[PDB]
């Protein structure tokens, strides 16, 4: 069942018949008489009502409402446009220990001014090295430059005037949104519902600047899930990597502490951050463990193939999750996929200088065992030859 807007001719005739039968007693409507003008004016009022009604009912539809009407009936539900964002990065500074610092530092790298974003300690640490988080002063994509050396804008007693940015990485810059891209992502949000699935928490972490990968605690970690007298799991923890910025993608504890406070809130357990109420967690880093890999027999393969094997192995170890064994079979498979199943290949893993490193052990099969809070980092890959052929 449905009743819709009538057509003009089908509407005018309805009025004329009704007017004639109930007023003139069935008499015909003679054109140009006074009743003719009365009937047509009545029809006009009839049609203007429908046209206006259809016009207004369109504005309630987000797919077609004008821009100024879209910002409202969208802010009511808590969906606002997005302004220009600010670029971010990490810096390092050194000086005489014990010197007094200030909460108004400013760094000039190359035609760009960056201001300290975290809380600067009152005095420089004992070791004389400090790492900060800085944000661009002018929002926009232009803050994503890649420079490695900058200078402090204003001199400070007891502190050097030269600073460095880890890896010259600066990311996060963007421009403001427009009406059309905003209409989408709003009527798209209407069809969405978050659920706190571990994927959501994992995804939320990557929003932090200069974060590349994120992994759960590895097999060699005995996690704790209760953290109280409760009958269902309550605690969640996971790692992070900064492959593009820090050496081996591992950051000092000064940074991961900041992430934990924002994501899980402070105090924890009261839903002060981006996590659910009554859920506690922690984000932790790991310490590097250097390894050396000796590939035997590659010297007798073509130079093109030799480089590919070296490049693939280096990439695989760089992406390896922390606190996980680095077995020999994984390295061997990479070689067989390219060199062929009939090639005389062999690999071995040894520590630099055959020394002893904390959290490292070798099992009978020849693999490498790594404990919690430790990661496998490539130090040098070398090719050796001790056989004869060809």
């Amino acid at each position: 069942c449905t009743i819709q807007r009538p057509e003009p001719q089908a509407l005018r005739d309805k009025i004329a018949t009704r007017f004639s039968t109930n007023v003139l007693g069935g008499a015909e409507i003679i054109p140009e008489s006074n009743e003719f003008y009365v009937v047509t004016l009545e029809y006009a009022m009839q049609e203007e009502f429908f046209a206006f009604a259809e016009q207004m009912w369109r504005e309630q539809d987000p797919r077609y409402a004008c821009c100024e009407n879209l910002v409202k009936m969208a802010a009511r539900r808590g969906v606002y446009p997005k302004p220009a964002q600010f670029a971010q990065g990490y810096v390092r500074m050194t000086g005489v220990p014990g010197s007094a610092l200030n909460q108004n530092l400013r760094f000039q790298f190359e035609n760009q001014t960056y201001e300290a974003a975290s809380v600067v300690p009152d005095q420089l640490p004992a070791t004389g090295v400090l790492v900060l988080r800085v944000s661009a002063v002018t929002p926009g994509p232009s803050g994503n430059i890649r420079v490695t050396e900058g200078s402090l804008v204003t001199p400070v007693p007891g502190i050097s005037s030269a600073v460095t940015a880890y890896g010259g990485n600066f990311c996060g810059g963007d421009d403001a949104e427009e009406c059309e891209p905003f209409r989408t992502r709003y009527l798209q949000r209407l069809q969405y519902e978050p659920r706190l699935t571990v994927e959501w928490l994992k995804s939320k972490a990557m929003e932090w600047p200069c974060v590349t990968d994120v992994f759960d605690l590895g097999p060699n970690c005995c996690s704790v899930n209760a953290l109280g007298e409760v009958e269902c799991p309550n605690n969640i923890e996971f790692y992070v990597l900064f492959r593009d910025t820090f050496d081996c993608g591992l950051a000092p504890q000064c940074v991961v502490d900041e992430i934990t406070d924002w994501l899980f809130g402070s105090p924890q357990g009261l839903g002060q951050g981006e996590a659910e109420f009554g859920i506690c967690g922690k984000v932790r880093t790991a310490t590097a463990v250097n390894l050396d890999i000796y590939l035997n027999g590659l010297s007798c393969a073509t130079p093109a193939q030799a480089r590919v094997v070296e490049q693939r192995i280096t990439d695989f170890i760089n992406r390896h999750p922390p606190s996980t064994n680095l077995t020999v079979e994984q390295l061997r498979f990479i070689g067989l996929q390219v060199l062929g199943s009939s090639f005389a290949f062999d690999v071995a893993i040894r520590s630099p200088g055959d020394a002893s490193q904390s959290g490292l052990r070798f099992n009978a099969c020849g693999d490498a065992e790594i404990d919690c809070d430790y990661k496998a980092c490539l130090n040098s890959v070398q090719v050796i030859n001790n056989n004869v052929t060809t």
């Binding site: 069942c1 009743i3 005739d13 309805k14 018949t17 009704r18 004639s20 039968t21 069935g26």
Partner: protein, 132 residues
């Protein structure tokens, strides 16, 4: 109430279809028949709209009533297109038919519209409109 209301509306609709299969004896009678129906449809409309019992039914009923009026009124006024004449005195049906039309065989039609004996029709007669 659904059983009663549905039955009455259906009966009225078919009754109108029955009136459309017969010739209107007179304009006054033809319109009287229409008034007998418009009341029933109007009466039903008020019941279905007393407390928004069925808004869609109210709209449909109202639209049907105007459609019925467009045809019932046309039949009464224009089916044979009757008109009143003014003769100078009472005369026989046969003579009246010959004068108005020119064919004495048409006196049969005058029987159903005009009262009075066949030898005293008048002094005012009701007949069709000559459209030579």
């Amino acid at each position: 109430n659904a059983i009663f209301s549905a039955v009455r509306v259906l009966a009225t609709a078919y009754l109108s279809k029955a009136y459309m299969e017969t010739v209107a004896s007179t304009v006054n009678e033809g319109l009287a028949q229409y008034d007998q129906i418009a009341a029933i449809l109007e009466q039903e409309a008020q019941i279905a709209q007393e407390d928004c019992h069925d808004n869609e039914f109210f709209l449909s009923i109202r639209e049907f009533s105007v459609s019925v009026a467009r045809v019932m009124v046309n039949r009464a006024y224009n089916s044979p297109a009757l008109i009143v004449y003014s003769f100078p005195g009472t005369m026989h049906s046969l003579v009246v038919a010959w004068e108005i039309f020119g064919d004495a065989k048409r006196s049969r039609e005058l029987e159903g519209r005009n009262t009075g004996a066949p030898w005293a029709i008048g002094p005012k007669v009701i007949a069709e409109r000559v459209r030579a």
